[PDB]
Amino acid sequence: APILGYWKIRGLCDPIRLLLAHTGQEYEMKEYSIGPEPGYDISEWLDEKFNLGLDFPNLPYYIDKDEGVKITQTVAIIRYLARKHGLVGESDEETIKIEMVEQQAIELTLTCKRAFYSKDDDQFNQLKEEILTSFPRKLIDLAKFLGENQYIIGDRITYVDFMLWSILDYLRLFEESLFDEASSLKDYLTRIESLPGIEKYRSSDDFKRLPITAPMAKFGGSI
């Protein structure tokens, strides 16, 4: 069975786990603990980081011994899984649209990540201000792009829908009022979370015990 490695949080790995839940692919989840404050001990990972044969040691990682693959980098992993499962564009037109949204979703995710793991209240507040001021426009742009479609390229779900749903879910949990100009994104959230494999994953004990972020974060550190 393939092995997915990550912290016991949703974090960056969330879209990968949603894609795997949607497809029903069998895999082993290798979870690494973060110890309690103030040490936030991460020994189980630090002891393995350099002994897994990874070219770029990091979390998340995906190892399938049977297929001969070992991959790090969230985007490389999710694209690999997307190709394996057919959740990619069937035209260059579709691929351009998927890749533009992939990058827009990552841009929002990184901005949130930087905010969530801010060093102090000053920095957290500065980055929250930038989010509250710039994200409304970006959510309108995403809504316009989606239009009347079920998913990003139309009727067929692709890997980018999982990346967009994860960040939109985090934003709904961080500031719900951000969707007051794009109710279609609320329907998008309901559509994807209602898909059977995703609903089963989200209603599982394993998912419900996951904080969004690691214990040191200014937001999401506790379920």
Ligand X SMILES: N[C@@H](CCC(=O)N[C@@H](CSC(=S)NCc1ccccc1)C(=O)NCC(=O)O)C(=O)O
Residues of the binding site for glutathione: 6, 113, 117
Cβ(130)–Cβ(114) below 8 Å: no
d(C-alpha 163, C-alpha 18), whole Å: 9
Binding partner of residue 11 among ligand X, a second copy, none, CB cut-off 5 to 8 Å per kind: ligand X
- Which of the choices a second copy, ligand X, none does residue 109 contact, using the CB cut-off of 5 to 8 A by kind? ligand X
Rule CB under 6 A: is residue 52 a binding residue for ligand X? no
Least spacing, CB of residue 212 vs a second copy, in Å: 21
- Residue among 90 and 107 whose Cβ is closer to ligand X: 107
Of how many residues is the chain composed?
Answer: 223
Are 82 and 158 a contacting pair, CB within 8 Å?
A: yes
Contact 7, 14 (CB under 8 A): no
> Under the criterion CB under 6 A, does residue 223 sit at the interface with ligand X?
no
Q: Report whether 160 contacts 103 (CB < 8 A).
A: no
Give CA–CA dist 143/221, Å, rounded: 29
Among 29, 46, 69, 132, binds a second copy (CB under 8 A): 69
The answer to whether residue 55 forms part of the interface with a second copy (CB under 8 A) is: yes
- Rounded-to-integer distance, Cα 80 and Cα 59, Å: 16
Q: Which amino acid is at 104?
A: Q
Among 6, 10, 63, residue whose Cα is nearest residue 33: 6
Alpha-carbon distances, residue 145 vs 125, 137, 142, 148 (angstroms): 30, 12, 5, 9
- Closest approach, Cβ 8 to a second copy, in A, equals 23
Report how many helices (DSSP H) and strands (DSSP E) the chain contains, helices first. 9, 4
Does 58 bind ligand X (CB under 6 A)? Our answer is yes
From a second copy, ligand X, none, interface partner of 113 (C-beta below 5 to 8 A by class): ligand X
Binding mask 102-141 for ligand X (x = CB under 6 A): -x--xx-xxxxxx-x----------x------x-------
For position 75 contacting a second copy by CB under 8 A, the verdict is: yes
Q: If you search the block for the tokens 């690999």, which residue do you land on?
A: 80
- The vertex-73 CA angle with 39 and 56, nearest 5°, equals 75
The only residue of 83, 173, 196, 216 in contact with a second copy, by rule CB under 8 A: 83
Residue 144 as a binder of a second copy (CB under 8 A): the answer is: yes
* Site residues (vs a second copy, CB under 8 A): 55-57, 69, 71-76, 79-80, 83, 92, 95-97, 99-100, 102-104, 110, 141, 144-145
List of residues contacting ligand X (CB under 6 A): 7, 11-12, 49, 58-60, 73-75, 103, 106-107, 109-114, 116, 127, 134, 170, 212-214
